[PDB]
Amino acid sequence: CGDKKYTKEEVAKHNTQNDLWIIYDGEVHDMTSFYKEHPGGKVILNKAGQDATSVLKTLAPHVKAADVVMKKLKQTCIGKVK
Numbered sequence: 001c002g003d004k005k006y007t008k009e010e011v012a013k014h015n016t017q018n019d020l021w022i023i024y025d026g027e028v029h030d031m032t033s034f035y036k037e038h039p040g041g042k043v044i045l046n047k048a049g050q051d052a053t054s055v056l057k058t059l060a061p062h063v064k065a066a067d068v069v070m071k072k073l074k075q076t077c078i079g080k081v082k
């Protein structure tokens with residue numbers, strides 16, 4: 001994830017398909033490039049700029065494809081929440 005720190009407020013500003021961040025386990029992830037390939041479609045924006053930990057750990061599809069979900073998270077961490 002690195003050393004960059006972000007406040008929840010700043011992360012919230014990245015809530016669009018061309019500027020999409022999400023928080024996972026206190027980590028800030030830039031998912032902008034993933035928008036188009038998200039198997040769930042546009043609904044990924046429902047948590048854009050917000051915490052998606054529970055969703056990513058418990059939603060049926062996310063569990064079935066946990067390998068893909070974690071791989072994508074591990075390619076997108078830009079910092080942590082402070």
Ligand code: HEM
Pocket residue numbers: 022031038039040041043044045046047048052055056059061062064065068069070072073
């Ligand atoms: C780490 C990357 C991902 C993020 C941040 C993400 C995020 C989300 C969010 C925020 C939602 C909407 C939740 C709600 O409103 O209740 C969602 C739905 C969904 N996601 Fe993902 N997702 C990711 C990866 C994946 C992968 C790899 C799959 C493939 C199996 C997937 C399949 C789905 C499906 C099937 C839905 C439901 C769509 C619907 O209800 O119409 N997601 N995802």
